[PDB]
Ligand binder design. Structure first.
Ligand SMILES: Cc1cc2nc3c(=O)[nH]c(=O)nc-3n(C[C@H](O)[C@H](O)[C@H](O)COP(=O)(O)OP(=O)(O)OC[C@H]3O[C@@H](n4cnc5c(N)ncnc54)[C@H](O)[C@@H]3O)c2cc1C
Ligand SMILES: O=CCCc1cc(F)cc(F)c1OCc1ccccc1
Length: 648
């Protein structure tokens, strides 16, 4: 594919037609001749290409006009329109870049942003570029939110986001170039170790995995082909459907076991009756063998008759022992080819629970909480390319984003007042909570995590309270959990050529406890994941004991002598973290992707213009629970807000 077509793809745009969004802002193009539309698209793609080819400097209108070839560089008005649209919507001149045109010194409109994670920072930089007065209020003593990098000595380790999900179409590709993230592709191989330390043999790792795929497709067939979505008044969870399809495979195994037993018994009865019938014939021949020995002309003919009759019963017998053979032959082969005894052996199921845990990792919640119909509604939006880890720590992104922003750390928002005339945010200093702050403004952008919005009683009071249609969405939606244990050693004792290895838990309930180990970093560091039901429960374990359990697993895989005591350790507790209350959102049973749209919807105080805006990973339907989705949501909101307070 070409250069300009690649730029559309990298911007998540169809290279050869206009989006609905573009059709709204450029109606004259839609109703116009086909030729002009083709010219529009080329101007849009080429502008994106100029920006994506060098995202480190601002791409100005003037510079765009100068790098277009004829006849495109001659339609100055259209070029400005396109450049302005792309800039407003954050498709060019986003992230951190050298400004050509320095910042307008008289600001226009005052926006408070709640929260200094990627969504807040991304919006903030936009709004600051559009010439507004932006202040962020962050409760932690750092920026980044759920991007949190641990650094001590040579050790670098991410406690929140750590993976970049393909660069094709990914806005983080731009930010990576801007910020100089060291990215590294993740090697796919992931050996598993049973709870006793033994490696899972390849036959089984392969067999179980393929059966995990088949099981999971069956739940999709149930949902998206049989409408198995609402059972006895309740929406079906993924975990529930998974139980169903396992139960049928178990039924299928039991039934072919029954058919086999029936085939055995039938052949045994045949042999039992045939042998008895052969028994009676030996007796019948016993009595004729006796008459033949006793034996005149009627005697001379008596012998021929007795011989003719004695050998006829031997033909009957020899012919039955022939059938005797082809039965006990058919029997012997059936006693040797039993079908499966059980669908899953005890070890097989434990290994299968690993794959389930891996999916509870990806979604941050136990499977029995996920919406069967919608849990993967975002799959059509995945980026192309291999996944990467941030070898220098993902915190480099929000820290770069924070440069030059008016960011008030240790400032926790307690109440958001919004009315038709303006807004007031009330916050306390987390170091001296008697100290209070009152921030007047024209608009509030709320990037508070869904976990904080769900908090009952509320951590942040809204005045007037949020409308029912918004609170209903917040209650319906899922906010999951996921935790990491960071182990820093003075020497690498694991396989260096492997990024991942799995610990197969002993029980289904605990299947997510320390189930996946990551080797990601220059220094000798391991990350152990705690997923599913284990995530929330493990937060109540002291660090010394949970690390002891890691070392117990690792000493089982590598030997008790090869595993030294760690020099430094860190354990996340995202659920108990008051500024997150969880890891990220998931589509809960009974929710749907539509709730992500309602989360993004701004609030207008009744009689009118909107004042309270929403960004964050829980507000972007096609990219939830990700860093880039948070980034995209901040860009989106900055465009929405600038449209309102500067003009569309
Ligand atoms: C353990 C873990 C692993 C993850 N794995 C990945 C991964 O590899 N890749 C990926 O793309 N995503 C992953 N994610 C998800 C990703 O980190 C998030 O989607 C993303 O960080 C969303 O950030 P946000 O800006 O929307 O919210 P946040 O980063 O939470 O920002 C909200 C901010 O508001 C602040 N705040 C809270 N309450 C208040 C208050 N009262 N007043 C003021 N400020 C307040 C918070 O401190 C925070 O800074 C993971 C997340 C976690 C936690
Ligand atoms: O550590 C953080 C993982 C959380 C996460 C949340 C998402 F919504 C999407 C992700 F890509 C993702 O991170 C990498 C990943 C990819 C596939 C399966 C599991 C994890």
């Amino acid at each position: 594919m070409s250069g300009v077509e690649g730029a559309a793809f990298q911007s998540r745009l169809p290279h050869d037609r206009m989006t609905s969004q573009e059709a709204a802002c450029f109606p004259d193009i839609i109703s116009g001749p086909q030729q002009t539309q083709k010219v529009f698209l080329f101007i849009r793609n080429r502008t994106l290409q100029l920006w994506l080819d060098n995202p480190k400097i601002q791409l100005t209108f003037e510079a765009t006009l100068q790098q277009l070839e004829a006849p495109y560089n001659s339609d100055t008005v259209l070029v400005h329109r396109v450049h302005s649209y792309l800039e407003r919507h954050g498709l060019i001149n986003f992230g951190i870049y050298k400004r050509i045109k320095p910042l307008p010194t008289k600001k226009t409109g005052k926006v408070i942003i709640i929260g200094s994670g990627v969504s807040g920072l991304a919006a903030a930089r936009q709004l600051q570029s559009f010439g507004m007065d932006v202040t962020l209020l962050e409760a932690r003593d750092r920026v980044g939110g759920r991007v949190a990098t641990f650094r001590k000595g040579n050790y670098v380790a991410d406690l929140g986001a750590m993976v970049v999900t393909g660069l094709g179409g990914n806005p983080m590709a731009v930010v990576s170039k801007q910020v100089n993230m060291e990215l590294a592709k993740i090697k796919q191989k992931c050996p598993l170790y049973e709870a006793n330390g033994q490696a899972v043999p390849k036959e089984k790792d392969e067999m179980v995995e393929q059966e995990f795929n088949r099981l999971l497709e069956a739940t999709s067939y149930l949902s998206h082909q049989l409408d198995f979505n609402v059972l006895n008044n309740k929406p079906v969870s993924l975990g529930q459907a998974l139980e169903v399809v396992i139960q049928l495979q178990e039924k299928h195994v039991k039934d072919e076991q029954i058919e086999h037993w029936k085939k055995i018994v039938k052949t045994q009865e045949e042999l039992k009756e045939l042998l008895n019938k052969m028994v009676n014939l030996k007796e019948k021949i016993k009595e004729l063998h006796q008459q033949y020995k006793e034996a005149d002309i009627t005697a001379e003919f008596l012998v021929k008759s007795k011989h003719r009759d004695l050998t006829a019963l031997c033909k009957e017998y020899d012919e039955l022992a022939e059938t005797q053979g082809k039965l006990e032959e058919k029997l012997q082969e059936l006693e040797a080819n039993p079908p499966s005894d059980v669908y899953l052996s005890s070890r097989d199921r434990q290994i299968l629970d690993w794959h389930f845990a891996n999916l509870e990792f990806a979604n941050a919640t136990p499977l029995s909480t996920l919406s069967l119909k919608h849990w993967d509604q975002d799959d059509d939006f995945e980026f192309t390319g291999s996944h990467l880890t941030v070898r220098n720590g993902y915190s480099c992104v929000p820290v770069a984003l924070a440069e030059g922003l008016d960011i008030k750390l240790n400032t926790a928002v307690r109440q958001v007042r919004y009315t038709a005339s303006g807004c007031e945010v009330i916050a306390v200093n987390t170091r001296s909570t008697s100290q209070t702050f009152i921030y007047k403004c024209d608009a509030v952008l709320c990037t508070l995590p869904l976990g904080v919005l769900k908090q009952q009683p509320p951590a942040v009071q809204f005045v007037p309270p949020l409308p029912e249609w918004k609170t209903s969405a917040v209650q319906r939606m899922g906010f999951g959990n996921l935790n990491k244990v960071v182990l820093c050693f003075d020497r690498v004792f694991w396989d260096p050529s492997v990024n991942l290895f799995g610990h197969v838990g002993s029980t289904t309930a605990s299947r997510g406890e320390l189930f996946l180990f990551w080797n990601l970093y220059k220094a000798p560091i391991l990350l152990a994941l705690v997923a599913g039901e284990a995530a929330g429960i493990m937060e109540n374990i002291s660090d010394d004991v949970i690390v002891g359990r890691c070392l117990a697993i690792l000493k089982g895989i590598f030997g008790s002598s090869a595993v030294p005591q760690p020099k430094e350790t860190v354990v996340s507790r995202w659920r108990a973290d008051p500024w997150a209350r969880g890891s990220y959102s998931y589509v809960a049973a009974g929710s749907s992707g539509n709730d992500y749209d309602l989360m993004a919807q701004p609030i207008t105080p009744g009689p009118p213009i909107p004042r309270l805006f929403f960004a964050g990973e829980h507000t972007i339907r096609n990219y939830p629970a990700t860093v880039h989705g948070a980034l995209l949501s901040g860009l989106r909101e900055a465009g929405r807000i600038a449209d309102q307070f500067l003009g569309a």
